[PDB]
């Protein structure tokens, strides 16, 4: 038995690759399509990967796909749509409080991926501001009975947001909050000590956000979702990644970096459950998609744009492709669960590699005349 | 004789350049058109370079040019075409097993670059899957008498592939296998210990592959073909480089990094020996070229695209240009053989240099109005 | 259950310390009393640590304490003494072959730590030279029935030693050999490929050896026993650490670096089971202790000295102190077995720290007038 | 033959160790007993190593052991003694020119290691000053017919020494000179361009020299004999290492660093062929040994001391031990010649390792009461 008593169970497993901390302490601000994940060993099929992920300290979901509360992406409609497929939705606060109240009533007065509560009503969350008049919003939201709320802000480290956190945690102890936006560990600490139940991480790296180009704030997305998640697991706090998502690759490598759920704003935009309706320009069927920092929210500054993106049909045909993509990525990484993927990442077993710009432009399609890219 | 007794034969030879391990342990994921090879000393003509390279542990070839088994590039046709010019071909498994059987019979029932066996029948290989029903494929392929097989897979480190390797190495001892795809040394170890006779290295970096952009797996190609070849020569195992080939430069610097043969998928596509036939779009005579990970192979995910590329005529006028390109590159590097090129690389004598993006965009044509680029 | 689905089982465990490869790739040639091992977490008592370690690929022992074959330390006497307490002994070859034959017969013709074979005769090994006349030694040793032999040499990488290994592995397949001395991975490879069953690592760092000061060869001991053991576990080969042992600390941190057994030459010298008998100088009861490289082995060069060391009584009172020391060190490191200690070392969980000369001179006793140091 | 066509002849040979330039470009001023040489592979016996080394561009010797011209070590006596055993000697210039003239006549008017010229008279060299009156010395030395001269100086980079080199190279073209002392590459260039035929490298690191402690000049010895030899082989110039020699280890690792011959000042002192005669202090038979920078050479400064060292008998019993030591070190390094040792060093095949102070104090004898160290 001498071949066992040298090391014990584990084979040699040569040291090719870079672990997470030697990748994110080189100082360079890497983003999603700037590194990539090296594979490992698989001993299991694609179908049996369990993507059960946690949203906050008491709310777990069957899929990590959550949506961002903008007025051009989610309502009660894609809320009930993602609640039917395991995710969660948040209702934007850019409306009257009574409209958000009857919106959050419409979803809870309403396929094995459950995401519904103890009394089999659907989990659904919402977004609330941080000004003093927003108390009159979320008290009516509690009468409607919302379960998790998002303290949506450009800067997550205000005196106003931590005062609001102290205002709900004494009044509403069962209710849970989502602090953000944070990008660094200092404001992550300054929210977690206030009693935040989960963070939403990432500012500036949105498909709409130009606040890096306008306010010079923020940081690259992947370094943020690594370091805030690395700090947040010290206290047992999940994080939520926003922005910089264009495909099923970015969300997979995003929650492989320590995130538990990922927040999809543009890639869930222009669906059949999205607000408004379709229109046409140059014969392309597309729906407008607009952030709050654009001046079309209602001496002001603008931190966002107004634009549009082509459609992708219903989510009920779209998010099974997303979970199949997460499912295949967590296959060929080599873990049977997302929890095992983060365990292999923080354990140093799962290894990465930095990627240069030429390997980026060869990572996609190249050296051909024309092509049709259909993902499913 | 004192000028000999200081060092002995060798002159000073100043230390300009970087050797391979100081280039590929900086952590950056370099690819083919991101570094380049510094020249040395030549004392010989272009014609007498011997590009004899090994495919697997008993199969050697007169040229290192092998093709990739897709249904849009090779059949028996370019198999007999590359067997006539020293290479090898593999028949794609995206057909019925009887069609692959009569395909591999058509090539062996059939100009000094030989690549034919002891009984002067042509060397020709094929590709086989990894599912349980594929036993009924490769047993008929053995009745047809194929010599080397490729266990084609997206992820080379499965329990299924090593179980298949154990299934052919006890049944068919003379038959030889090609494991893959691997990109790192760990799965290279986990295939070589099973009894793999040669690897095929490189995933995601294909001209069709978007699985880096979709599944977040893989790594850059040049670092993969350096490190898997650096591990594989410990056990005397050749490797085969796939993807990221656009020209005769990439294959030359690819097999200069430790690869013995290189696998050409797109640059051998759209030939007279390619499947289907030509068609026209915008007046350009081009042939469709499609990978298996595209959904046009037959709830599914897609790891490839369907597209097309312009033609290059017959290979019998094309691969002499490729071997002349390899021949001139191995000239001005300074080695009389590919084996001497790898000996100078692992010995530290042959040296490289990293290249930046501005030196990349000046490496090609620049500072002129228009040009005609004809390679031969 | 959200506190489990972030990481899974494992707590935060901050990154204080250095793992083994970042300690032994800084280039500095660290030795035993130049680094030290940081503690971890214990959840078990001192008595239940299992120090079962492997000698070669089929020979496992209950303690890792083996002795070095010099003519001034071991005979049949300390062979039966260490066989009674789980270890192994080797009989020096600096005698006539008939004397080594009746020595190895005396030990096998002869307290729960067993170290005896299938037919309950004591495991005992011996040492054999490498010259051509030594065939007539080890064939008589096989008639006496020795189980493991040590191809004792100053340089383990000779053509003569690998020819000898090929000479016993075809004649005597059940018999097992110990190659050495090696200090680097190249000669470790050049012995393992010949069929060596276990290495003995470390030259020059002995208490007698001045061959570093005379032949300028060798390397520091701890870097050798890390790197040769790191190479040797690729093929499932144990290593044996010689020299530089003054205390129970050095052997503990020595086999914590990848060694399975450790070879004790001077710290087992001057016992009641040691050759010759005691004598007196300045009223101190001490026994002479001499290596083979001294000119007193029988135009010659000398690689050793002749000297003496004070006594320590019987080993049966001494090696229980040694196993209690190993037992307490493997306690406060935090592993229930030596195999778990090497698993935590190669896994990166067990961490080290380099130590400077001032922390060395404060690591021992300091800042007092006089002291009595009694270890048990 | 595929196992040959991957690399060609050379096996894997793992990358354990440090080559010379990564050891001597870390910036630390390493000396002889601060690093050590890792072994390699041997396929040959000890007796057949050929230590033929070159002194200057036309003078080769059978052993690299030369002596330093002080008035307390060499005369005609140890000149004829080392000429009988292959070396060379130099006669100190601290005498009248007629005394040096009849000294150099006594040696040439006078066992297979030859070191004698074309007309079978003994090779013997001498040392000459650099002041203007020294012309009247070396012209009489040329009438006596000396073959190589040493332009002995504390600082080898004077205008006076290069003017002297221009003064002998036009007058005496067959005569050859030894420039020095140099420690850096700049003064090595400024002597080689003048027409120096070989350098003598190393100031301050002598057993007598306190000019580092007094004039703050010089550098550590091993870095000097690496870098001046690395510059000097660009022009095909041998170098001669002085000082810091206490044993046969230092001269072996000294000429392994690029030196061709090594200059022995103290370890050849106090012999039967040394000047003066023996005397006694505390019952130890010892002979006085004094450098020129001491004030006992004849407002002055002193760069040396006057002292004594115990005897070692005749050199004819002593330098066979030295060549046997060089012979065994060049054995277990793994080269059949000194030229092959320098070829393996500059080729990067021969590798080193830095050594710390604790591994230094364990490199010698330790952990014992008392010992007798006899080297032969
Ligand atoms: N990438 C991102 O995540 C990102 C980045 C920028 C903006 N945004 C979007 O822009 C929206 C608006 O951002 P915003 O926070 O700047 O608008 P806001 O109206 O919520 O706050 C405006 C400013 O007033 C301050 N503030 C907050 N509460 C206050 C109070 N009681 N009294 C006085 N001042 C108070 C804040 O510091 C803020 O700078 C957000 O809903 C967010 O969704 C998102
Ligand atoms: N750049 C590249 O080299 C690259 C990358 C990606 C895909 N591809 C191409 O895509 C093709 C298909 O790739 P694929 O391997 O994902 O498709 P596949 O049908 O061969 O395997 C599908 C999945 O099932 C699993 N599998 C394999 N054998 C199984 C078995 N008996 N039972 C259950 N599951 C099994 C595998 O893990 C795999 O994830 C390949 O032929 C390959 O050529 C190439
Ligand atoms: N720290 C250490 O481990 C260490 C270091 C040095 C020496 N030693 C001790 O010194 C002892 C003697 O060492 P040694 O190997 O130098 O003495 P040796 O008599 O075994 O070998 C002497 C030399 O002859 C060569 N040799 C071996 N077999 C030969 C053969 N058939 N024919 C011709 N030459 C042959 C070897 O290369 C060696 O240099 C060893 O038993 C060893 O225990 C130990
Ligand atoms: N480790 C060493 O190698 C080392 C170091 C220091 C000294 N030494 C010994 O000390 C001895 C004396 O050393 P030294 O060179 O300082 O004594 P020196 O008498 O030869 O020279 C004395 C000084 O005068 C200068 N000099 C040389 N030629 C001159 C000339 N024509 N006119 C005017 N000035 C001139 C020199 O620069 C020197 O500083 C040397 O023989 C040498 O062997 C050896
Ligand atoms: O108006 C805006 N200005 C700046 N950032 C915004 C704005 N609206 C939404 N965002 C961010 O963009 C994210 C959506 O991600 P994306 O659309 O997929 O890039 C949200 O979660 C917000 O963090
Ligand atoms: O469908 C696919 N999805 C991803 N990679 C593919 C697919 N088909 C072929 N490949 C890879 O692409 C390589 C062809 O190289 P290229 O076409 O010259 O870039 C093959 O050897 C495969 O490794
Ligand atoms: O004579 C010798 N010269 C050099 N090394 C020796 C000699 N004799 C024994 N050794 C080494 O010293 C080790 C003993 O370790 P130590 O006595 O505890 O320092 C042995 O295992 C040998 O490797
Ligand atoms: O008087 C002196 N002052 C400083 N260095 C000296 C003196 N005399 C000799 N040396 C140097 O010491 C070397 C002798 O080496 P060692 O005696 O073996 O240390 C000579 O080759 C000179 O370079």
Numbering used by the authors:
A (entry chain D), B (entry chain A), C (entry chain E), D (entry chain H): 1 to 110, 233 to 420, 437 to 514
In the authors' words:
To better understand this partially inhibited state, we collected cryo-EM data of IMPDH2 with saturating substrates, 0.5 mM ATP, and 2 mM GTP. Under these conditions, we observed the non-assembly mutant Y12A was 84% inhibited but WT enzyme was only 16% inhibited. We resolved structures of not only the filament assembly interface and several distinct filament segments, but surprisingly, two different free octamers; a canonical free octamer (a dimer of tetramers bound by Bateman domains), and also a small class of free interfacial octamers (a dimer of tetramers bound by the filament assembly interface). The 3.1 Å resolution consensus assembly interface map is identical to the uninhibited and fully inhibited consensus interfaces, including a well-resolved active site with strong density for both substrates; as with the ATP/IMP/NAD+ structures these filaments are actively turning over and we have likely captured many states, which we have modeled simply as IMP/NAD+. The interface between tetramers is formed by the 12 amino-terminal residues of eight protomers, which each extend from the core of the molecule to bind one catalytic domain on the opposite tetramer, in a shallow surface groove formed by a short helix (476-485), two beta strands (51-63), and two short loops (355-360, 379-380). A key tyrosine/arginine interaction (Y12/R356’) anchors the attachment; mutation of either of these residues to alanine was previously shown to abolish assembly, both in vivo and in vitro.
